[model samples]
Target: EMEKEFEQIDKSGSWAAIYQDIRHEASDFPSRVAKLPKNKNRNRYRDVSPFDHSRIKLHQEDNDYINASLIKMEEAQRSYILTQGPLPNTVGHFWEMVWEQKSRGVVMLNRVMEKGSLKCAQYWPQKEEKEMIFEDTNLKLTLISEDIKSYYTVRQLELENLTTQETREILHFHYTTWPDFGVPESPASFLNFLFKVRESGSLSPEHGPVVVHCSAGIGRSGTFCLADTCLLLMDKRKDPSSVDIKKVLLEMRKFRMGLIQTADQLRFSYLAVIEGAKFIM
Candidate 1:
């Protein structure tokens, strides 16, 4: 059997799952188009924040400075979903890319399991389970469990230099840094993360590139990526360097299709990159 990797990720939000299972697509969705419990999270997909729209624009103009990037929606059917966030939390779309890439370097950011598959997740993804088959995408992938939640992040550049072989503990994250509400601790934690990566000696050519994804992938990560790129361009000087969003987006689209996304995301990204210089420095 030609066994390949790429865990199956299914969009189980079927009609039966909604009515019988009582599942909801996101924390918030319009009553007319969506069903079940709604508005549990702050940033709802239906009504995206103003800043998010602009961030997308900014990213398009200046993405060469961006070593990391967010995935823009390219689907015509759900083109509207890109206005805010994806209805299905963008995880399913990411799974599609993984399957297409047939990549071995991809890793998971969140470890939460589907509520309905509670039993299978807890038992099947345990320490002993070296490799497990995920029914959703029909993917058989390994799990890199983060010990302390929150601050931990999967830094690909750092991971490669740390070890050539697979390791569950390659300093992906420290603990408690997601959904960073512009908190000072988040930056503090990030610096701590950098120190750990730096201490891994020096990374050489053989190391692979790090891949990270979190929700919109245009927020904290987008900010971090831009920050790193900007600083690198400035020779490690922590000053937000402006880039051309339009050019960047067009180049990215040629290769990966969507990059900046909507107006809000592009704008927010600009402010984030500009303002981040102070925070990161």
Candidate 2:
């Protein structure tokens, strides 16, 4: 039986079993990072590595039940810059933050390579890019992408990248358009993914709606404003409210706390919500 308290996304315990079954019963992340991998830098934020979904894996100790575990790369632990940050408690739900993960559920949007600044702390200048990497599983785990081509062609959800320009289709678009990428399914859908965007960075039109969620989805909530920024940027152009951005966010927060927890995250919306918006410096 699933837990009645489904307000949080983590949905741990027996209840979470429903999400996987309903959404294909996907195990932990597609890539389970066992240990921090070796990075060029050994001193900086490497110690605060972010969760990369593409490299997620499904690990089973006794080849029985699926469990979540981090796969550390060679020397990944040596560099504090790329090492794992503090994590949340076992029953912490999604709001609580533990010292293990330092920063729970946070993903960066603007890459340091871009002109955008990384002073926000979410930016990992040298964080290596990973693809859809997977590992063996036990719980009959099958991490499959959503594809309604034969069923529902048009998906109701969309994850538009607010920062990527000239970047063309974003992850959300690619998911809905192409079946190769993580297709728009339950938790992995453009809509479901929207439940995960956050962190300290700009929303580029090139990347589409960049998702930076950890096991719980907090840092992104408290750190970034890409969601509001992109919405305001795209909506303000005409009538605005085109995406029901505010209402949508409110609804999201009801389930999870800290979407706009920090002042910086709030700033993204304030500056872009209306016309003649400008950065506060």
Candidate 3:
């Protein structure tokens, strides 16, 4: 039914209306924490704040706010901590969330600079730098190794809590080709990257939730989660037709508002799900 719906929607070119429907349905919950004067600077975008209920709270005294949401897909056994690109001031908080949540991987869907504008701060160490220290959180990140590909780069980083003297390996999956406010070029390449992350076992239930972030933590991030969850559901059900993408997206919206940002991105999600379903089938 979903596949047929996708074809019909594509043929009819009603993606705008469909995306509008989803935008209308997604809850507009309050983000009071993100609006506080003390927390205002911590947010990357004023309007793209995390929902109050699902926002991840830091354990630091007098600093509990971070522009991140814990999105849990129970049936799929998937959990993603979605957050915006870190601000210069909040970079420490970003690593703190990674450490606090025990996240094994960070899926970065945007580059540091795009179109002459800074989309995100240089949160991690560059290959040449090899290491970055965040004095605020007292954590250090060392670039272990980097595997570069055509459209993406996989970096292995070692995160250390200076106070605790404990360290963990964090897989940094950076998709370089996905433009801001745009979808990837094609579903096949996107699926290839998605499966690469899957093969690493970082997204497994045994590890903590994988940290997923775009510029605003929605849009491309939402599309990625939607496609991955749908394919996993298809595998579990053994019936690709039974996975209702709209419903799963709506469910995800409960944890973070505005999961998918545009009609084109929404359509891309459908295209990606349909393309990815072939493998499961």
Q: Top lDDT: which candidate number? A: 3
Candidate 3 on 14-78: residue-level lDDT in tens? 99998888888888888898898998788777778888999999999987999999998988989
Candidate 1: 10-residue stretch with minimal lDDT: 1-10
Worst 10 residues of 3 by lDDT: 179-188
Model 2 TM-score relative to the real fold: 0.26
How does each model score on lDDT?
Answer: 0.31, 0.26, 0.89
Higher-TM-score candidate among 1 and 2?
A: 1
Candidate 2 stretches greater than 4 Å from native: 1-106, 109-210, 214-216, 219-238, 241-245, 272-281
| Model 2 RMSD, rounded to 1 decimal | 19.8
The sequence of per-residue lDDT tens digits that candidate 2 reaches over residues 72-146 is 212111101111222211111111111112222223222222234332222111112312111111001111232
Name the runs in model 3 displaced over 4 angstroms.
Answer: 128-130
Q: Which residue pairs in model 3 clash with each other?
A: none
What are the RMSD figures for all models against the true structure? Answer: 17.3, 19.8, 1.3
lDDT of 3 at 243: 84
lDDT of 1 by residue, 123-197 (tens): 123342464443433334444553543556443211111123332322233223433233232245554444344
